[PDB]
Amino acid sequence: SRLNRESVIDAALELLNETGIDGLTTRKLAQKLGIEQPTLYWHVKNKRALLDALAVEILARHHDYSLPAAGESWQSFLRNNAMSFRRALLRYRDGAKVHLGTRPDEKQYDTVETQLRFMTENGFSLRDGLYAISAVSHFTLGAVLAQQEHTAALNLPPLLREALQIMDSDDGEQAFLHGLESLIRGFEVQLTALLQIV
Amino acid sequence: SRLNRESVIDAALELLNETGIDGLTTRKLAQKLGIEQPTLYWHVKNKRALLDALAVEILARHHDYSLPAAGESWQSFLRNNAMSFRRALLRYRDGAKVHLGTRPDEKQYDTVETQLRFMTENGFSLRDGLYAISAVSHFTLGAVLAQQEHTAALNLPPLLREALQIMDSDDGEQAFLHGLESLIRGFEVQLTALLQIV
Ligand SMILES: Cc1c2c(c(O)c3c(O)cccc13)C(=O)[C@]1(O)C(=O)C(C(N)=O)=C(O)[C@@H](N(C)C)[C@@H]1C2
Ligand SMILES: Cc1c2c(c(O)c3c(O)cccc13)C(=O)[C@]1(O)C(=O)C(C(N)=O)=C(O)[C@@H](N(C)C)[C@@H]1C2
Ligand SMILES: [Cl-]
Ligand SMILES: [Cl-]
Ligand SMILES: [Cl-]
Ligand SMILES: [Cl-]
Ligand SMILES: [Cl-]
Ligand SMILES: [Cl-]
Ligand SMILES: [Cl-]
Ligand SMILES: [Cl-]
Numbered sequence: 001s002r003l004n005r006e007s008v009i010d011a012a013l014e015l016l017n018e019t020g021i022d023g024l025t026t027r028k029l030a031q032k033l034g035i036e037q038p039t040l041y042w043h044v045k046n047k048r049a050l051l052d053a054l055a056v057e058i059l060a061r062h063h064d065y066s067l068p069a070a071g072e073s074w075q076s077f078l079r080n081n082a083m084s085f086r087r088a089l090l091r092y093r094d095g096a097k098v099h100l101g102t103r104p105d106e107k108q109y110d111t112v113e114t115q116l117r118f119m120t121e122n123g124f125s126l127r128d129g130l131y132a133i134s135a136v137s138h139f140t141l142g143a144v145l146a147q148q149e150h151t152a153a154l155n156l157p158p159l160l161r162e163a164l165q166i167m168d169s170d171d172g173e174q175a176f177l178h179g180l181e182s183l184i185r186g187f188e189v190q191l192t193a194l195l196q197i198v
Numbered sequence: 199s200r201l202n203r204e205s206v207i208d209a210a211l212e213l214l215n216e217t218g219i220d221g222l223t224t225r226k227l228a229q230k231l232g233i234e235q236p237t238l239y240w241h242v243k244n245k246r247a248l249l250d251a252l253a254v255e256i257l258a259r260h261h262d263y264s265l266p267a268a269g270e271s272w273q274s275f276l277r278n279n280a281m282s283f284r285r286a287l288l289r290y291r292d293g294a295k296v297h298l299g300t301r302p303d304e305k306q307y308d309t310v311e312t313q314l315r316f317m318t319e320n321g322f323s324l325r326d327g328l329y330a331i332s333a334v335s336h337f338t339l340g341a342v343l344a345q346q347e348h349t350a351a352l353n354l355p356p357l358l359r360e361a362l363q364i365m366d367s368d369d370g371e372q373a374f375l376h377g378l379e380s381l382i383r384g385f386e387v388q389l390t391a392l393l394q395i396v
């Protein structure tokens with residue numbers, strides 16, 4: 001079939017959903033595209049190259065709160081951005097694992113730059129803006145990974161028994177959103193303290 | 199060589215450091231132990247069984263702040279526990295990935311129960327105690343994974359360039375510890391608010 005970048009990525013994302021990240025291979029991608037492997041090689045050199053591109057395209061396609069709204073608070077931007085990021089990672093099987101280890105791509109430079117600049121325009125030093133952004137990303141990635149890897153993996157004292165019931169009651173969104181608010185408020189307490197002991 | 203549980207786990211942890219999680223296989227474990235695979239099978243049924251045990255034993259061996267000190271504040275316990283947890287996951291290659299997806303083992307029941315009870319004894323509902331514990335775990339796992347998966351994976355606008363320099367300056371501990379304080383303070387703001395709008 002068609003082997004331009006867009007179609008190769010379409011097919012690879014479909015495959016990712018079928019196989020997961022560990023089970024995703026260039027060989028299976030070739031088959032899905034109805035081609036021989038040396039034909040695929042011209043287009044996609046190896047799995048790493050493929051994963052790198054998927055990590056970019058999953059956000060490009062499904063992560064639509066990359067930028068603050070006009071006038072939006074930094075609190076609200078981090079919240080909306082974290083929720084968007086979470087949703088995008090959850091959209092494909094092992095999506096968080098696909099993201100893990102990556103760095104912003106040239107195609108994301110202006111987007112991530114803008115976010116860093118935005119934090120600095122709201123009173124954060126680059127450093128603290130970065131630490132806030134990173135903490136949100138890590139918290140979000142950790143939460144999604146827990147959800148996704150638990151699924152893949154598929155007596156009790158009483159609190160643990162009930163804790164496990166609480167976690168088996170929804171997908172993880174409640175715990176995530178509750179933690180997200182704690183995180184953001186913590187950033188605000190820090191930002192507002194300036195040089196005061198806090 | 200010797201094939202009691204302790205020695206199999208010793209060998210598998212050494213192998214994990216050599217190969218990483220994806221590259222860890224029962225076949226390579228057999229070789230490292232100088233045995234045939236059907237001999238290993240008697241002892242270890244598959245990779246999943248092996249990973250499950252490694253996840254338990256890495257904490258049992260190296261995660262020594264499982265429990266609060268007498269009189270310790272919940273703030274301090276979460277801090278110490280998160281740092282201990284982080285250190286233990288970092289001790290082996292892909293250690294965070296080994297942990298991911300697991301649930302407490304029967305051998306950890308009393309430990310995790312105690313932590314849940316402890317939170318409840320300091321004013322948290324089981325729910326909120328759990329959400330605090332989970333958020334800490336997810337934040338910690340996300341931070342470690344970022345560090346570990348970045349390593350495995352191994353023009354710029356100016357803030358991104360500097361951000362990347364800041365991140366290439368240390369291992370991730372600074373950003374982690376800064377985020378951890380934000381998280382814990384956020385939990386405290388929530389706990390203290392009770393039914394007040396906050
Ligand atoms: C600033 C930054 C970001 C990310 C990132 O990986 C990163 C890094 O690896 C080193 C230095 C800086 C950054 C994100 O992955 C990303 O997910 C992302 O690409 C991104 C995006 N493209 O919209 C985001 O929404 C950001 N958000 C989750 C906090 C975050 C921004
Ligand atoms: C309470 C709990 C915990 C963990 C956990 O996975 C879990 C779960 O999957 C479902 C319900 C409850 C829990 C931890 O992994 C663990 O890492 C852990 O086993 C653990 C331990 N064994 O000491 C901890 O230190 C805890 N800490 C990182 C917050 C945390 C406790
Ligand atoms: Cl073509
Ligand atoms: Cl194209
Ligand atoms: Cl492959
Ligand atoms: Cl706002
Ligand atoms: Cl990452
Ligand atoms: Cl023996
Ligand atoms: Cl033994
Ligand atoms: Cl295997």
Ligand SMILES: [Cl-]
Nearest residue numbers: 269270271274
């Ligand atoms: Cl204390």
Ligand SMILES: [Cl-]
Nearest residue numbers: 146298299300
């Ligand atoms: Cl997990």
Ligand SMILES: [Mg+2]
Nearest residue numbers: 099102103104
């Ligand atoms: Mg990233």
Ligand SMILES: [Mg+2]
Nearest residue numbers: 297300301302
């Ligand atoms: Mg766990």
